[PDB]
């Protein structure tokens, strides 16, 4: 199951709306929970959540000490849409002691902002250079290390410093040849169309996430005609795109431009009523 | 309530008191409203429920 973007605040009630999601098509904001205690998060888990297409934001969630039980299999943050150029935001998470996103293999676009988390350790142990390309634009300041010593114990080492997420979880490292594709527990590369992980090697129907596009249970390089690229991660048909446009006619009224199903016509284009096709403006745009 | 500039952490800890049990509900908003300028209890309550 693919779920839309979600903002969960005040109390954990609405969080169970994530129980069947394996992909969040949009962002995931979990914030402003002041009366939440660790007790509340004991048996709370979302093992199905594999991927976020936009960003993950966590702000002022009291009692949450780690993300290792909440999102144990979150493998990819696609970063299609970012929160001020960041795909991952951990801000003023007052009781967070570790990140623990031990399955996070790739942040496809955008940077990481981890700030003002006074109990947060296990950050120095994370080699982000294996998750992001744009590590230079990360902003990881004012955490427990900036004001104290973290007893970070862990395993792979890189320049030499050992890499881990928690006291009991190393950082997964695949052979250089495997690139971003992922690899099996035996070290065998996943198919060239996979991203982060897979259940079996050299099979694009055995991926956990796609390097490019998802179609019909497979990781494809491109959405072929008659399909359209949607949310920069999956292939959809004309009908799906049309039904989104009319569902919002009663939020965005979706259009067709350059083999994509997009929320709005680009600069200098207007929608030719009927076929959803973006046509260039004769003079100004209405 | 005491009228003042509420910025950063101060804004968050203030808004939480204002909201209480009810909870919370080139762009400009609450920072321009309540940090750059001053907000009423009524102006801050508009962010609750």
């Amino acid at each position: 199951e693919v779920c839309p973007g979600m903002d969960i605040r005040n109390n954990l009630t609405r969080l169970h709306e994530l129980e069947n999601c394996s992909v969040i098509e949009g962002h995931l904001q979990i914030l402003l929970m002041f009366k939440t205690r660790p007790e509340d998060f004991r048996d709370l888990s979302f093992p199905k959540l594999i991927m976020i297409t936009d960003y993950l934001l966590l702000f002022r969630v009291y009692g949450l000490e780690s993300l290792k039980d909440l999102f144990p299999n979150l493998t990819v943050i696609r970063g299609s849409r970012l929160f001020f150029n960041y795909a991952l935001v951990i801000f003023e998470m007052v009781h967070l002691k570790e990140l623990g996103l031990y399955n996070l293999m790739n942040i496809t676009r955008g940077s990481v902002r981890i700030e003002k988390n006074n109990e947060l350790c296990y950050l120095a142990t994370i080699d982000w250079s294996r998750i992001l390309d744009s590590v230079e634009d990360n902003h990881i300041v004012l955490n427990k290390d900036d004001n104290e010593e973290c007893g970070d114990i862990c395993c792979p080492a890189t320049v030499f410093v050992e890499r881990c997420w928690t006291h009991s979880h190393c950082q997964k490292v695949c052979p250089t040849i495997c690139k971003s594709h992922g690899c099996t527990a035996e070290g065998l590369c996943c198919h060239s169309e996979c991203l982060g992980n897979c259940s079996q090697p050299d099979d694009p129907t055995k991926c956990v996430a796609c390097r490019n596009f998802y179609l019909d249970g497979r990781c494809v390089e491109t959405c072929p005609p008659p399909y359209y690229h949607f949310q920069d991660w999956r292939c959809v048909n004309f009908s799906f795109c049309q039904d989104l446009h009319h569902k919002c006619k009663n939020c965005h009224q979706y259009v067709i431009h350059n083999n994509k199903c997009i929320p709005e016509c680009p600069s200098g284009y207007t929608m030719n009523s009927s076929n959803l096709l973006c046509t260039p403006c004769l003079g100004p745009c209405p | 309530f005491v009228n003042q500039h509420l910025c950063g952490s101060h804004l968050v800890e203030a808004l939480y008191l204002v909201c209480g049990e009810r909870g919370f509900f080139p762009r400009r908003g609450i920072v321009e409203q309540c940090c750059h300028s001053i907000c009423s209890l009524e102006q801050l309550e508009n962010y609750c429920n």
Binding site: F59, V89 | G8
Partner: peptide, 15 residues
């Protein structure tokens, strides 16, 4: 600041 952006995005009023 970024915190200002966050606050401006997160804190939404009632219509």
């Amino acid at each position: 600041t970024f915190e200002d952006y966050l606050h401006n995005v997160v804190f939404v009023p009632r219509p």
